[PDB]
Amino acid sequence: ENLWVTVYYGVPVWKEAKTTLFCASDAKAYEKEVHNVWATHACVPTDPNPQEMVLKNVTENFNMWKNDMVDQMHEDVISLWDQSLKPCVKLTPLCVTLNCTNATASNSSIIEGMKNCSFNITTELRDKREKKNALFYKLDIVQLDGNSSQYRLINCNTSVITQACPKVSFDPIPIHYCAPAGYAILKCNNKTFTGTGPCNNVSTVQCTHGIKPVVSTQLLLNGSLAEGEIIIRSENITKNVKTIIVHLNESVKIECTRPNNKTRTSIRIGPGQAFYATGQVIGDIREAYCNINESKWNETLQRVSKKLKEYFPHKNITFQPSSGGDLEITTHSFNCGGEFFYCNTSSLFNRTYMANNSTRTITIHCRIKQIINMWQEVGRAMYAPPIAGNITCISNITGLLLTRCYGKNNTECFRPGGGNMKDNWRSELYKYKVVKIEPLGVAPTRCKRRVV
Amino acid sequence: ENLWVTVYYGVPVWKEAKTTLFCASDAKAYEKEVHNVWATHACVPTDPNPQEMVLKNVTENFNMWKNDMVDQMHEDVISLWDQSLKPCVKLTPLCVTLNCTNATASNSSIIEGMKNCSFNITTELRDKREKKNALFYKLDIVQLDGNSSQYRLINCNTSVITQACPKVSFDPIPIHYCAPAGYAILKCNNKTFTGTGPCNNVSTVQCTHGIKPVVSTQLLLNGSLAEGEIIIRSENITKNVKTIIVHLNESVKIECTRPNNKTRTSIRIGPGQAFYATGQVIGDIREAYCNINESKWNETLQRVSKKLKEYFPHKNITFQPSSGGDLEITTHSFNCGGEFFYCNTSSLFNRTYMANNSTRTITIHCRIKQIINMWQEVGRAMYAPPIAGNITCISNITGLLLTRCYGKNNTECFRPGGGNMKDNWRSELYKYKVVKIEPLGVAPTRCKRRVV
Amino acid sequence: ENLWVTVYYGVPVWKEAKTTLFCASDAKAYEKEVHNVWATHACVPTDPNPQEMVLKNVTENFNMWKNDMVDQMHEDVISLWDQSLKPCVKLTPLCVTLNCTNATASNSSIIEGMKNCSFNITTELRDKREKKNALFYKLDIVQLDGNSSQYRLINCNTSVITQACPKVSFDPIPIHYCAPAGYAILKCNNKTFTGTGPCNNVSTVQCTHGIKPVVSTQLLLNGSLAEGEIIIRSENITKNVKTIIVHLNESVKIECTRPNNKTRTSIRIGPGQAFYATGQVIGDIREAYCNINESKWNETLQRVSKKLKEYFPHKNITFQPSSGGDLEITTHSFNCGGEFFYCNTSSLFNRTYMANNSTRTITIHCRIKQIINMWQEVGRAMYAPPIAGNITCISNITGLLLTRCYGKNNTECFRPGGGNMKDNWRSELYKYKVVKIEPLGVAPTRCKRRVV
Amino acid sequence: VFLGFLGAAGSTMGAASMTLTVQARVWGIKQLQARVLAVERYLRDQQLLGIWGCSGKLICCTNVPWNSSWSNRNLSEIWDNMTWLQWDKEISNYTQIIYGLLEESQNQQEKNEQDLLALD
Amino acid sequence: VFLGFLGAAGSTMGAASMTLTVQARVWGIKQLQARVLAVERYLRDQQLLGIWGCSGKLICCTNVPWNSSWSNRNLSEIWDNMTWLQWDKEISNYTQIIYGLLEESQNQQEKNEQDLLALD
Amino acid sequence: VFLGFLGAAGSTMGAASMTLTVQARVWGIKQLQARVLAVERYLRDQQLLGIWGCSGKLICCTNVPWNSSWSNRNLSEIWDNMTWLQWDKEISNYTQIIYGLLEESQNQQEKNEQDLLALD
């Protein structure tokens, strides 16, 4: 009795919903004269501080494998390459027949994996064309059927190629996501949260922490570390269609280097356009390699097997190397120093486990490639201009994109190789969630409005 | 005395004004895996239900021949084609000299209206070109001023050509026009309203009904039907410069077919781009034709003459066939099954009238054409790739775009052929009007505000 | 005691800040049937009247040499050229080798400054190419490093040329700059204000007066006149890095004419594209020239020396001609009648002064040029099609973009030639300033709110 | 429950005043322009009411006496017959004037309230 | 001044009613769409309050009696017991009904005020 | 009739307070951004007044006592003789403090009204 409606505003309640999220960048955006790296050129807003505000007693549901933020991350990452390759030179005039032979390093020693090609190209005057020459990797070249001296660029019979502008060199600059006014980006602080199910220590923020837009295939490198011990995530660990994102609490250092120099030479394609190819190769014959502290890898694989068999305590666990086929899918990949590696990781995933640091470094030999059919797109390609000087690179492994195979034996199988590239960014945005606030409410109380 | 101002808000009053109208599409979108047909791909918002709300005792003015909505419809229709032809292959490389001769169907029988052409084109390798061959209609080809065996594409000496992407096949998907918040789309329900002058049974809606974006020249096919008997419309029936839109309350079925079969062959232009031409023609020699129930046409023309001579009761009325000139203007047209037709309608408009159903089918022989100088634009063209298999089409005539000529005799003249393409869309948006609401008003009353 | 807060809204106070300014234009749009001149194509909010409202007692600071409006003006001026040259024909196909010789006017007299070139170009059919011919100024041509009869376009070895569409003829249509709702465009009325320092007679407006977007180098022609006597402006007159903008209160008429006649001829580049070269030159051989009333120039330079030596009363003042180098920087430039001039101004700036009107017309011989490396950009160019008939031009000098040199003698030096193109528009927007209103304030008063 | 929209047009001024709350209630940059048009056209008419003291009232009575220089009617029975549209066609000649009077009246009230409460 | 944004969530309703003012307080096109979304979402909830007479009140009491057909609680011992989230999950079934009642109640008050002051 | 704009600047605060209603009253994306800037900059200052209880008042008197830690003058003789720009240059040091006091004061009033009418 004597209860009437009363309307509140500013009620703290929310409901899940998708929205368009800002893109931001650190106020330390770019320092090489701010020559328009995609993060600084597009994600203009500067350093929104994450003023985290814990929530006393909230119990909130999370679901990483179907959240709204990952798709936006993938779309932005794909689209930010198109907005930067558009002005660069097209290599359409270069898709001509090539008369190509073997290359030779110093002392006339044949160099494996290279071929000295010569081709006809139009000069500044459109009536004249001359016979230039440059050196292509064997993986940028497909032999024209029949004669052994005729070749053609691998990609220029399916799609157009565009050289990457050297002035906009790509780098993993961190990216901050901030929900627009009216929304709120929650997140979970439970330091053993398994990626799905409720979290009892939710908190909100203006924006996500700096997220590196790394690109890689099977070692999820330069990531962030878990705060507890090794964690394992999957929508259904049993089902093979789902990538088993293993997340490391112990970074394992990995080095990769290219021990010889490259001669960058400029070939003019026409009015005001330059095409940088690789001339003579300087230095001795080598294959770019990578190093890992064998003690640390032994320990980390022991730990991952220990954690993984808690879900399969009955039987042994066997790791296996990549199956085989296209280098694009069967090899750990990255872009250290502006040149794309492609490493063979068969030697790192052959250890097996049964039921019940500067020493012994492991080495793995890595190919290199220039014409990248970027993972971000199919039906188009890119050309990475050669980089002078030997390139050394150091990074911290912080995860594995395993996946389980159907071995005939009676024990478990896990081999590297993810099924999609979204899993790279789903190892950083597994905490967050985005909700829309509904600050209007109605409740009963002991009041009725005045009559005057 | 004792009267003071008082201001009302939410007053229901309005005034005519132009505005930017939403573009919507049925929730039943193009569902061949939703490969982005222009209508739903761009006009995303889905099926706003027309909650019609009749207005009591309202008297409102209408003027179809100068309304604001038709121009927006025409601009949107023109623009939606440009936004969909942009990515498709350009046929600029194909505008080369042709060595072309007569074609032959089975049994070496000469086929009229075709010519087996062959030409030099650059292959995937830009240094190699080969002699391909394809068959062009005689209307896509203009003889070079010289030897009788040299030919050139009809349109590639004035403007560029772009092939229509097969995956975005055009179709009349209905389009709903909705005014933005603040405006209101009125309409007339008087079922004998003659296109101008006030209506006494106005009503409002969120949006227009589904409007088919049909393209045609002289028979307004697949349209909507009047609710009473045949209606005649014009800004001034006497003046010849104005199209006399006749609107049928009785649909007259029309069929059209292309009995031949077509061989689609793929000629590569370069990287990734494909160009679909017509190879050998299969089946016996024929000419695409159309059928009309002669009884129904006799009756419909009797009715239209009966209604038309009420404005000219003194003298007889004579229909006449199209005068002559370019096929683009002197012939019924449509785009059944993805291939354009051009029908001769001289046999349908020769009946005459004096003062005071599966039988006898009429036939009319229709040309076919590929390189369309689309009515929507001048100075550019399009190429419609050949469609395999014989194509049958059925549609309902629901109007005539007549126009009166100056015959020497003492009786009236009316021949098909409109003067502009806007009249196609002015037969659906002759009901509606768009007005801006002005919900602020003032009035006198017996009140003055309190002093406290 | 008994003083409480009270909040006012609509307070008239402001603070300087950069903002996005409207771009407007007179309702008197492009006179030639509104065929989309840049100012009429996009910037067309119709004639916002400058309702100037003087401020009784304001004392406000101004700083022309660092104001926010000049940069927006420069960006808009650069950008509105790109939006108008985009659809015009690219002359990439025309950068072919040329076989060129000497030209001749009537009576076989050699016409110095022209060369009769001939070249191979592809016609409507992409398999046929023919030998055409045209006449290029010696400044549009660079001799190939080889035989003396081979030539190549000056600019087609660094960038891509684009012809200017004749239908969008450029003209200084005035442009009004209006601040958006919330801001206010102040200005100074002190008629001897020297470009920096506070003004005691501020006033506000909806918009700036009509500002002509003139392009020139050393004589700020067709400008606005100061209201007092000759004014001198600079950030620091002593320092040489800053242009000394002299402002004339007395307009000095200047004429420039091109007595020759030009034969415009059309060379087809391909499908629907035309290239307007120059054929035979009609009329007798002459060089375009400019005229100045020597009495008025003598008087104006006397006045400028009188005003300038008030800052150096103990020194003689010596004007000097342009030093030398590219015609782009050493010659008074403009665009009369659609063809760019390049005038030598050495004869106008050799007068000297010591310490303590239809007669004697001066003449200066002006080059002419077609392929303009427009001041607005570097790395791209433009082609100005030839204009038929002789062209006469009349304009009013209203300023000098002087700059002081380091002469060996102890007396002063000043030679024409500005260091940047922004000074052209900083002679019109030296009055205005843009501020943001902050209409919320707080002050104490003898009131407290009611309790009921 | 949605009561339709604009259904009280015609009818009478007396009847339409009891349903005022019915009228008060992706294709590129073309559509965003429509959104901004709606927002700004609402904000115009909603700020213009605050200046007159009628901050949140659909029907508001104010201090500005009427005179026959503007429209003149008995509006005892005419008030129930006008109807609204005919009224706008009638009094539109003088709406530009009434706003200044209302603004001055509101300024008077606000200044008076600020002065009187200084004695509190 | 700033005090976080959502800390009162998860606390009891009675305690959270004192922090209402905390919750109440180039990519180009991508950011502009979000900005317009924020503006229009705020205007929706700030007009829906004006229609009910609560023009500028965070907490507003109004004339619509409660009945057990909607959510039923003691809400004397249970008030300041549930947190706003559970309450929203409880009464969300009937808000679309309450809004019409509030609208009609506000119309009644405005009409009554306009009628009574005619005798002034 | 349009009374110009911003003309009261430079005059004494006493006189300028009677013209408050004067100050209160398409190149694609750039122009649209300008429009959205205007809309949002108005809405911010219009919401910042509702939080203080001055929902629709140009001149508003409120419950927050003054103290000399902020700007201090004999503001009966210096109420005039001072001009708005100089006043803002004087008191701009402490507005961020005053806003919180006003917010808390408004919350107090709303809570008090909610509690008192529980007896009615």
PDB file of N, CA and C in Angstrom, chain B residues 5 7 442, chain D residues 48 51-52 62-64 70 94-108, chain F residues 1-3 21 25:
ATOM      1  N   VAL B   5      -0.788  35.249 -24.497  1.00  0.00           N
ATOM      2  CA  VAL B   5      -0.142  34.269 -25.357  1.00  0.00           C
ATOM      3  C   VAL B   5       0.056  32.969 -24.597  1.00  0.00           C
ATOM      4  N   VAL B   7       2.092  29.081 -25.637  1.00  0.00           N
ATOM      5  CA  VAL B   7       2.876  28.371 -26.642  1.00  0.00           C
ATOM      6  C   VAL B   7       2.682  26.873 -26.457  1.00  0.00           C
ATOM      7  N   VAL B 442       1.695  29.102 -31.355  1.00  0.00           N
ATOM      8  CA  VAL B 442       1.218  30.030 -30.341  1.00  0.00           C
ATOM      9  C   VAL B 442      -0.265  30.263 -30.575  1.00  0.00           C
TER      10      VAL B 442
ATOM     11  N   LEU D  48      14.562  26.921 -28.076  1.00  0.00           N
ATOM     12  CA  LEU D  48      13.716  28.097 -28.222  1.00  0.00           C
ATOM     13  C   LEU D  48      12.645  28.153 -27.143  1.00  0.00           C
ATOM     14  N   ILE D  51      14.232  29.654 -23.567  1.00  0.00           N
ATOM     15  CA  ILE D  51      14.374  31.103 -23.513  1.00  0.00           C
ATOM     16  C   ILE D  51      13.101  31.774 -23.025  1.00  0.00           C
ATOM     17  N   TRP D  52      11.951  31.115 -23.169  1.00  0.00           N
ATOM     18  CA  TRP D  52      10.666  31.677 -22.770  1.00  0.00           C
ATOM     19  C   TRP D  52      10.223  31.207 -21.393  1.00  0.00           C
ATOM     20  N   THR D  62       2.048  32.015 -20.516  1.00  0.00           N
ATOM     21  CA  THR D  62       3.126  32.992 -20.376  1.00  0.00           C
ATOM     22  C   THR D  62       2.555  34.403 -20.341  1.00  0.00           C
ATOM     23  N   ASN D  63       3.427  35.365 -20.020  1.00  0.00           N
ATOM     24  CA  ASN D  63       3.030  36.755 -19.766  1.00  0.00           C
ATOM     25  C   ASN D  63       3.345  37.634 -20.978  1.00  0.00           C
ATOM     26  N   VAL D  64       2.409  37.651 -21.919  1.00  0.00           N
ATOM     27  CA  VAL D  64       2.468  38.563 -23.061  1.00  0.00           C
ATOM     28  C   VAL D  64       1.041  38.820 -23.537  1.00  0.00           C
ATOM     29  N   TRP D  70      -2.539  41.418 -34.257  1.00  0.00           N
ATOM     30  CA  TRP D  70      -2.371  40.043 -34.700  1.00  0.00           C
ATOM     31  C   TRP D  70      -3.741  39.458 -35.024  1.00  0.00           C
ATOM     32  N   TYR D  94       2.571  36.991 -37.950  1.00  0.00           N
ATOM     33  CA  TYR D  94       3.063  37.714 -36.785  1.00  0.00           C
ATOM     34  C   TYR D  94       3.874  36.871 -35.811  1.00  0.00           C
ATOM     35  N   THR D  95       4.207  35.622 -36.145  1.00  0.00           N
ATOM     36  CA  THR D  95       4.978  34.801 -35.220  1.00  0.00           C
ATOM     37  C   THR D  95       6.366  35.378 -34.980  1.00  0.00           C
ATOM     38  N   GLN D  96       6.947  36.044 -35.980  1.00  0.00           N
ATOM     39  CA  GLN D  96       8.286  36.596 -35.813  1.00  0.00           C
ATOM     40  C   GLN D  96       8.335  37.668 -34.732  1.00  0.00           C
ATOM     41  N   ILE D  97       7.182  38.203 -34.328  1.00  0.00           N
ATOM     42  CA  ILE D  97       7.148  39.290 -33.354  1.00  0.00           C
ATOM     43  C   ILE D  97       7.004  38.740 -31.942  1.00  0.00           C
ATOM     44  N   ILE D  98       6.167  37.714 -31.776  1.00  0.00           N
ATOM     45  CA  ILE D  98       5.805  37.236 -30.443  1.00  0.00           C
ATOM     46  C   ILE D  98       7.034  36.742 -29.691  1.00  0.00           C
ATOM     47  N   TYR D  99       8.033  36.243 -30.421  1.00  0.00           N
ATOM     48  CA  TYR D  99       9.198  35.660 -29.769  1.00  0.00           C
ATOM     49  C   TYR D  99       9.992  36.705 -28.995  1.00  0.00           C
ATOM     50  N   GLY D 100      10.143  37.911 -29.545  1.00  0.00           N
ATOM     51  CA  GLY D 100      10.844  38.954 -28.814  1.00  0.00           C
ATOM     52  C   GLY D 100      10.129  39.335 -27.530  1.00  0.00           C
ATOM     53  N   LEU D 101       8.801  39.455 -27.596  1.00  0.00           N
ATOM     54  CA  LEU D 101       8.030  39.763 -26.397  1.00  0.00           C
ATOM     55  C   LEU D 101       8.216  38.682 -25.342  1.00  0.00           C
ATOM     56  N   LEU D 102       8.157  37.415 -25.754  1.00  0.00           N
ATOM     57  CA  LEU D 102       8.328  36.324 -24.798  1.00  0.00           C
ATOM     58  C   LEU D 102       9.724  36.347 -24.187  1.00  0.00           C
ATOM     59  N   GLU D 103      10.741  36.625 -25.005  1.00  0.00           N
ATOM     60  CA  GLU D 103      12.107  36.686 -24.497  1.00  0.00           C
ATOM     61  C   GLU D 103      12.260  37.791 -23.459  1.00  0.00           C
ATOM     62  N   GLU D 104      11.731  38.980 -23.757  1.00  0.00           N
ATOM     63  CA  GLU D 104      11.807  40.080 -22.801  1.00  0.00           C
ATOM     64  C   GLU D 104      11.078  39.724 -21.512  1.00  0.00           C
ATOM     65  N   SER D 105       9.902  39.101 -21.635  1.00  0.00           N
ATOM     66  CA  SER D 105       9.156  38.705 -20.447  1.00  0.00           C
ATOM     67  C   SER D 105       9.945  37.723 -19.594  1.00  0.00           C
ATOM     68  N   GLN D 106      10.593  36.737 -20.216  1.00  0.00           N
ATOM     69  CA  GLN D 106      11.363  35.766 -19.443  1.00  0.00           C
ATOM     70  C   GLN D 106      12.548  36.429 -18.752  1.00  0.00           C
ATOM     71  N   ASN D 107      13.230  37.341 -19.450  1.00  0.00           N
ATOM     72  CA  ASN D 107      14.334  38.054 -18.815  1.00  0.00           C
ATOM     73  C   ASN D 107      13.844  38.836 -17.605  1.00  0.00           C
ATOM     74  N   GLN D 108      12.677  39.473 -17.727  1.00  0.00           N
ATOM     75  CA  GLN D 108      12.107  40.174 -16.582  1.00  0.00           C
ATOM     76  C   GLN D 108      11.956  39.244 -15.386  1.00  0.00           C
TER      77      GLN D 108
ATOM     78  N   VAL F   1      13.540  40.801 -33.129  1.00  0.00           N
ATOM     79  CA  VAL F   1      14.596  41.473 -33.936  1.00  0.00           C
ATOM     80  C   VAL F   1      15.966  41.062 -33.416  1.00  0.00           C
ATOM     81  N   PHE F   2      16.863  40.702 -34.332  1.00  0.00           N
ATOM     82  CA  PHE F   2      18.210  40.299 -33.947  1.00  0.00           C
ATOM     83  C   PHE F   2      18.941  41.488 -33.333  1.00  0.00           C
ATOM     84  N   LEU F   3      19.448  41.306 -32.114  1.00  0.00           N
ATOM     85  CA  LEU F   3      20.103  42.383 -31.384  1.00  0.00           C
ATOM     86  C   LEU F   3      21.611  42.325 -31.577  1.00  0.00           C
ATOM     87  N   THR F  21      20.504  36.619 -23.316  1.00  0.00           N
ATOM     88  CA  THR F  21      19.824  35.819 -24.327  1.00  0.00           C
ATOM     89  C   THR F  21      20.373  36.056 -25.724  1.00  0.00           C
ATOM     90  N   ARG F  25      21.437  32.525 -27.642  1.00  0.00           N
ATOM     91  CA  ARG F  25      20.807  32.138 -28.898  1.00  0.00           C
ATOM     92  C   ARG F  25      21.818  31.497 -29.843  1.00  0.00           C
TER      93      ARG F  25
END
